[PDB]
Scaffold this motif. Structure first.
Motif, mmCIF file in Angstrom:
data_model
loop_
_atom_site.group_PDB
_atom_site.id
_atom_site.type_symbol
_atom_site.label_atom_id
_atom_site.label_comp_id
_atom_site.label_asym_id
_atom_site.label_seq_id
_atom_site.Cartn_x
_atom_site.Cartn_y
_atom_site.Cartn_z
ATOM 1 N N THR A 1 0.824 -1.207 0.000
ATOM 2 C CA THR A 1 0.000 0.000 0.000
ATOM 3 C C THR A 1 0.860 1.260 0.000
ATOM 4 O OG1 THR A 1 -0.187 -0.002 2.414
ATOM 5 C CG2 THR A 1 -1.856 -1.216 1.166
ATOM 6 N N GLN A 2 1.965 1.250 0.748
ATOM 7 C CA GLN A 2 2.862 2.404 0.744
ATOM 8 C C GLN A 2 3.525 2.582 -0.617
ATOM 9 O OE1 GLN A 2 4.990 0.647 3.800
ATOM 10 N NE2 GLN A 2 3.642 1.340 5.456
ATOM 11 N N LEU A 3 3.916 1.479 -1.255
ATOM 12 C CA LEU A 3 4.462 1.574 -2.603
ATOM 13 C C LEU A 3 3.396 1.996 -3.604
ATOM 14 C CD1 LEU A 3 6.979 -1.399 -2.660
ATOM 15 C CD2 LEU A 3 7.411 1.057 -2.490
ATOM 16 N N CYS A 4 2.128 1.683 -3.333
ATOM 17 C CA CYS A 4 1.045 2.183 -4.173
ATOM 18 C C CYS A 4 0.867 3.686 -4.003
ATOM 19 C CB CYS A 4 -0.254 1.447 -3.844
ATOM 20 S SG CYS A 4 -1.745 2.227 -4.508
ATOM 21 N N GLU A 5 1.048 4.190 -2.781
ATOM 22 C CA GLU A 5 1.035 5.637 -2.576
ATOM 23 C C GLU A 5 2.189 6.303 -3.321
ATOM 24 O OE1 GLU A 5 1.533 5.308 1.547
ATOM 25 O OE2 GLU A 5 -0.209 3.979 1.680
ATOM 26 N N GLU A 6 3.376 5.697 -3.260
ATOM 27 C CA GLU A 6 4.498 6.208 -4.044
ATOM 28 C C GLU A 6 4.209 6.134 -5.540
ATOM 29 O OE1 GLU A 6 7.463 7.645 -3.667
ATOM 30 O OE2 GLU A 6 7.173 7.971 -1.518
ATOM 31 N N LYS A 7 3.472 5.112 -5.975
ATOM 32 C CA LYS A 7 3.074 5.017 -7.377
ATOM 33 C C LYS A 7 2.083 6.114 -7.745
ATOM 34 C CE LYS A 7 2.095 1.018 -9.350
ATOM 35 N NZ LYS A 7 2.539 0.910 -10.766
ATOM 36 N N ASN A 8 1.190 6.466 -6.820
ATOM 37 C CA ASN A 8 0.291 7.592 -7.047
ATOM 38 C C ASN A 8 1.074 8.889 -7.187
ATOM 39 O OD1 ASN A 8 -2.886 6.831 -6.448
ATOM 40 N ND2 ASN A 8 -1.435 5.430 -5.461
ATOM 41 N N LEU A 9 2.104 9.065 -6.359
ATOM 42 C CA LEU A 9 3.003 10.202 -6.540
ATOM 43 C C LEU A 9 3.693 10.138 -7.899
ATOM 44 C CD1 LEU A 9 5.192 11.726 -3.764
ATOM 45 C CD2 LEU A 9 6.221 11.297 -5.990
ATOM 46 N N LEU A 10 4.020 8.928 -8.352
ATOM 47 C CA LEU A 10 4.641 8.757 -9.661
ATOM 48 C C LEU A 10 3.685 9.166 -10.779
ATOM 49 C CD1 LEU A 10 7.460 7.575 -10.533
ATOM 50 C CD2 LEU A 10 6.257 5.440 -10.960
ATOM 51 N N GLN A 11 2.394 8.880 -10.612
ATOM 52 C CA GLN A 11 1.409 9.325 -11.598
ATOM 53 C C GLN A 11 1.187 10.831 -11.533
ATOM 54 O OE1 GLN A 11 -0.303 6.188 -9.995
ATOM 55 N NE2 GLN A 11 0.595 4.943 -11.634
ATOM 56 N N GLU A 12 1.272 11.416 -10.337
ATOM 57 C CA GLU A 12 1.289 12.872 -10.237
ATOM 58 C C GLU A 12 2.446 13.452 -11.039
ATOM 59 O OE1 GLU A 12 1.640 13.123 -6.065
ATOM 60 O OE2 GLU A 12 -0.217 11.991 -5.759
ATOM 61 N N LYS A 13 3.620 12.822 -10.939
ATOM 62 C CA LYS A 13 4.743 13.203 -11.790
ATOM 63 C C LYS A 13 4.400 13.030 -13.264
ATOM 64 C CE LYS A 13 8.522 12.157 -8.556
ATOM 65 N NZ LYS A 13 9.705 11.283 -8.324
ATOM 66 N N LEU A 14 3.707 11.941 -13.608
ATOM 67 C CA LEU A 14 3.262 11.727 -14.985
ATOM 68 C C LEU A 14 2.472 12.921 -15.501
ATOM 69 C CD1 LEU A 14 2.076 7.981 -15.200
ATOM 70 C CD2 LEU A 14 3.473 9.139 -16.926
ATOM 71 N N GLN A 15 1.461 13.337 -14.741
ATOM 72 C CA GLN A 15 0.594 14.419 -15.199
ATOM 73 C C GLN A 15 1.336 15.750 -15.237
ATOM 74 O OE1 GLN A 15 -1.504 12.728 -12.279
ATOM 75 N NE2 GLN A 15 -1.961 11.136 -13.795
ATOM 76 N N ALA A 16 2.159 16.029 -14.223
ATOM 77 C CA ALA A 16 2.956 17.251 -14.250
ATOM 78 C C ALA A 16 3.870 17.278 -15.470
ATOM 79 C CB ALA A 16 3.770 17.377 -12.963
ATOM 80 N N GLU A 17 4.502 16.144 -15.780
ATOM 81 C CA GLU A 17 5.419 16.089 -16.908
ATOM 82 C C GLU A 17 4.679 16.209 -18.229
ATOM 83 O OE1 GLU A 17 7.723 12.486 -16.173
ATOM 84 O OE2 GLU A 17 7.776 13.208 -14.098
ATOM 85 N N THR A 18 3.469 15.657 -18.327
ATOM 86 C CA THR A 18 2.742 15.785 -19.588
ATOM 87 C C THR A 18 2.218 17.205 -19.787
ATOM 88 O OG1 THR A 18 1.228 14.577 -21.043
ATOM 89 C CG2 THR A 18 0.392 15.176 -18.870
ATOM 90 N N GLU A 19 1.869 17.904 -18.702
ATOM 91 C CA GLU A 19 1.524 19.318 -18.827
ATOM 92 C C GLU A 19 2.738 20.133 -19.256
ATOM 93 O OE1 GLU A 19 0.513 19.464 -14.869
ATOM 94 O OE2 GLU A 19 -1.401 18.412 -15.094
ATOM 95 N N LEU A 20 3.889 19.868 -18.633
ATOM 96 C CA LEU A 20 5.115 20.550 -19.025
ATOM 97 C C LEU A 20 5.518 20.193 -20.450
ATOM 98 C CD1 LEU A 20 7.094 20.234 -15.678
ATOM 99 C CD2 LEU A 20 6.103 22.308 -16.670
#
Lengths: 49, 49
Positions: free
Chosen positions: A20-39
């Motif tokens: 579950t903690q690694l899933c939270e880190e994966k959610n942060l990774l998807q936040e990075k995904l969206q930030a990077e696609t906006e950039l």
């Protein structure tokens, strides 16, 4: 058997919480995904400009 | 003992699946995110250039 597999149960539950903690880190990774696609959209816009 | 096994064996399959789509797929997505970050850094460098 109850003792040994209760220890095993506790270990597997701790591994579940680790998943579950690694899933939270994966959610942060998807936040990075969206930030990077906006950039990336902004970068392509500036490039075509 | 049996219900605790199912509390553990059906928990072990949960560990397996959450590791292959939350820890291994996590690492695959991490590689993808690193590639995206490096390519966007190159894009922004080309932008300012």
């Amino acid at each position: 058997t109850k003792e040994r597999q209760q220890k095993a149960e506790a270990e597997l539950k701790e591994l579940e919480q680790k998943h579950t903690q690694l899933c939270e880190e994966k959610n942060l990774l998807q936040e990075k995904l969206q930030a990077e696609t906006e950039l990336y959209a902004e970068a392509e816009e500036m490039r075509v400009r």
